[PDB]
Each structure stands twice: as structure tokens, then as C-alpha cells.
């Protein structure tokens, strides 16, 4: 048996286990992951519909919200769920074909599959309501989505490796995932904030990725200066390098 085949086997089994425990005993989690974008959209439109109409009179608010929200939901899930994978299977590390990175990859693939299903369903009901739901340049959208996915998975693995001890710090990162929602262009277009606050917001790679995904989605969408893809690409590459290094070095102490 090749190492690749046993890797597929262990990933399949771990995916089955983690999909069973991610949703409820009678699949109550699927309702929550379908309803959370709905509640977010309801609150956001009912709070800023006229303001966003005044912002630019060319893009409807719900499609803008979906395109900026579903990738952020996937990124937040990848960051916040990948790091609990170590403590969920402490007792499972006794069968000599199971490694922590297998749990990491299983959780990541599930997060990706679930959010992709949610994205497809959301685009379907958005087109069903008479909105705009076809990306003009879908290949660049796929590229930016892949960059965002790799950045999120790398950060999740990095936080899983570093915070194997001190679980209080785990909680902390979830708190820091709340302001990241309110800054990275998810709610309101970034053309309305006063310009001197701009570069302090431009070190956030998720802002750049959201802006480029929206630009590749809509026809004739305007981006600001310094919203290059090179900065998120380099951030993701460096984060993945450091995460893999730290997992390799601190490998043996992730035992039972």
C-alpha cells in the first residue's frame, strides 16, 4: 500500500466522522449554515439599503452583500474551525495511520465543500429573484477564491500548531475575527471611508481579496490604488511556509 492510498483512506474516514459531528444528530447544522447568510442579509439591507443605493447607483445591494459575504464566511470558517481539530481527536492518535495534518485537511475540505454548496445555492436564489448572478470573468474569480482559500487554510493550520497549548488564546482569535468582518469591505463599499484611513486598512489581505473578487464578478467595477493581488499572494505563501515549518518542527509533541 502506497502512502498516498492510505492518505486517501484516512482522509475519507476522518471526513465522514467530522461531517457526522459538524451537523447535529438529525442534521440541524445545515439549517443554521443556510440561515446565517439570510439573517446577515436581512439585517444589512434593512439597515443600509438607502445608503448603499446612494453609494453607487450601479450595483444592487443583495448581490454585493452575497459576493462580499460568502467568501468571508468561508474564510472565517476555515480560520476558526481548523484550529479545534487538534483537541477534538486527542485520543484518536493511537492507530499509527492517523496524523494531525489529516484532521486538518479533513476539516478544511469539509469547510470548502459546505461553503461552495452555500455559494451555489445563494447564486441560484439570487438569479431566481431577478438579480445579477453571472460573473463576467469567472476564471479570475476562481483564482482569487483559490488564493483566499489557501490563505485561510494556512492561517488555520498555523493557529492550530501554535496554540496546541494555552487554549485560552484559541478563544482570543475568534474575538479578533469580529472586527475583521467590519473592516474588510464586506458590509459597505470602501469608496466611502475618508481617504487618510485608507493605508491602515490596506495591510489586511482579505480586503484586497474581497475587492478583487467583486471586481471580477461585476461588470465595470472600480478598484482603488494598492489593491494588488501580489500582497495577498505573498502573505498567503509566507503564512503557508511558516505554518508547514512549525508543524514539521513541532510534530512529535502532538501525541495523546
Amino acid at each position: 500500500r502506497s502512502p498516498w492510498q492510505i492518505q486517501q483512506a484516512v482522509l475519507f474516514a476522518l471526513f465522514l466522522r467530522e461531517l457526522k459531528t459538524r451537523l447535529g444528530g438529525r442534521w440541524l447544522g445545515v439549517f443554521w449554515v443556510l440561515l446565517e447568510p439570510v439573517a446577515h442579509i436581512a439585517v444589512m439591507t434593512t439597515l443600509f439599503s438607502l445608503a448603499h443605493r446612494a453609494a453607487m447607483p450601479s450595483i444592487e445591494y443583495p448581490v454585493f452583500l452575497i459576493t462580499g459575504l460568502i467568501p468571508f464566511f468561508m474564510f472565517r470558517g476555515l480560520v476558526t474551525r481548523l484550529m479545534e481539530a487538534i483537541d477534538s481527536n486527542r485520543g484518536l492518535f493511537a492507530y499509527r495511520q492517523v496524523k494531525p495534518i489529516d484532521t486538518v485537511i479533513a476539516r478544511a475540505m469539509l469547510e470548502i465543500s459546505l461553503q461552495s454548496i452555500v455559494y451555489l445555492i445563494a447564486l441560484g436564489t439570487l438569479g431566481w429573484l431577478g438579480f445579477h448572478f453571472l460573473p463576467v470573468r469567472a476564471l479570475e474569480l476562481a483564482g482569487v477564491s483559490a488564493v483566499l482559500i489557501m490563505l485561510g487554510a494556512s492561517l488555520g493550520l498555523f493557529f492550530a500548531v501554535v496554540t496546541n497549548e494555552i487554549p485560552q488564546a484559541r478563544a482570543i482569535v475568534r474575538i479578533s475575527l469580529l472586527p475583521l468582518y467590519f473592516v474588510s469591505g464586506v458590509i459597505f463599499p470602501v469608496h466611502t471611508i475618508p481617504p487618510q484611513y485608507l493605508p491602515l486598512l490596506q495591510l489586511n489581505p482579505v480586503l484586497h481579496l474581497i475587492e478583487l473578487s467583486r471586481a471580477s464578478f461585476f461588470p465595470q467595477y472600480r478598484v482603488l490604488q494598492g489593491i494588488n493581488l501580489a500582497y495577498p499572494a505573498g502573505f498567503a505563501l509566507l503564512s503557508l511556509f511558516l505554518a508547514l515549518m512549525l508543524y514539521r518542527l513541532r510534530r512529535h509533541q502532538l501525541a495523546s
Partner: protein, 224 residues
Amino acid sequence: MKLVSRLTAKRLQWALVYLPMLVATVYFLVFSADRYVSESVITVRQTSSREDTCYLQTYIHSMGLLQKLDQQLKLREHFGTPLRDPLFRLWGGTSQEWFLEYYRSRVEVLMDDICGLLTVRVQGFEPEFAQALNRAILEESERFVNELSHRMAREQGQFAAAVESARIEATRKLKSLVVVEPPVLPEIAEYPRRWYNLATLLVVCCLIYGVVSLVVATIRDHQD
């Protein structure tokens, strides 16, 4: 249950990956038709103000302009010439609403809020036809704005010394359209991008095949 197990990975791959490739490859490289585009940028201005730009943007996708253009250049018979492509062609005998939707899908108007310019891109199966359609749209546009101004001034004159001023206002083209870039003449087709469409299709079918394989495997495992 039993119907869930009545398949395999190769069967799913043939159902969701290579068959769309076959139909897309025999469409785009064989059955498709070229679509040249012609591009212009216009903006009105008071002689001797984004409102009249809105009037123009609504008027381009209007219905009366479509009737005038069909009377002038006979768009209905032109768009049915490419039988090769049964989809992007205009089937004869269709209703007026579908014709209006087809025309709205062909000519595309875009606005930029920072500068206020109105860009028009017109799709046609011939380059000279696309240029002629763009020029006809522009001249009917200018005629519409001038006719609106003349209608207001003619109503003012119809209310009624001031008669000469009303006649001058009726004759004077107060609002005029200035063309930043004249309607261009295309050389090759650019909109039916075959290879890019095939590539994004490849990404899409790979993704849905992976997702459906995972969910069918988990429902097979749960059903046992």
C-alpha cells in the same frame, strides 16, 4: 437507496465532466457564430447635468427606438441570418417582448459615476452593420434630445412680442450631443471567447463533480 448504489465513479465522471466538454467543444469550435462589437462614448451638454444622461440611458433600451431602428435597418431579418448558431440567433415569428429582450441583450450601455460618460457597445454579426447600428443609435439619440427641447418650447409657444421668442426657442437646439469617440469599425470578433469559456467550464464541472462525489459517497455510507 438502490438507485443511489446504481452508479460508479466512472459513470459519474461521464455524467458530469466529459459530456459537457463534448457538447461545449462541438458548439464553440463548430456550431458557434462570430459577434463583432462596436464601441462609442457619448455625453450631452448644454449649448452656449446627469439628468439628460439618465433620459438617454432609458431611451437607448426603450421600445420606440427599437421600432424606429427596425423600420430603418431591419434588425429582425439580420439577427436571423446565422442559422449555424441556433441560440444566439433570433428565431423568426417570435413575440415582440422576446425581440425587445434580445435587443436589450445585444446593445449594452454602461455608466461611470466619476466622469458621467455613457459608453455603448453594440453586437452584430457583421462589422459594417454594427457600425451602422451604432451610428443610427447616436443620431436617433441626438434627434430625441433635440425633439424633447423643441416639444417643450413648442408647448410654450402654443400657450401664446413673446411669440418670436417662443419661435426662436422652438428652432434653437438648446441641448446638443457631443461624441468623444465615433462608432468604431471592428476587424475580428471578440465576444464569443471559446477557450476562456471552456476553461471556466472546466473549473466549474471539476468543482461540482468533486462536491457531488463527496455527497454521494457519504449518502452511500449512511444508507448502509
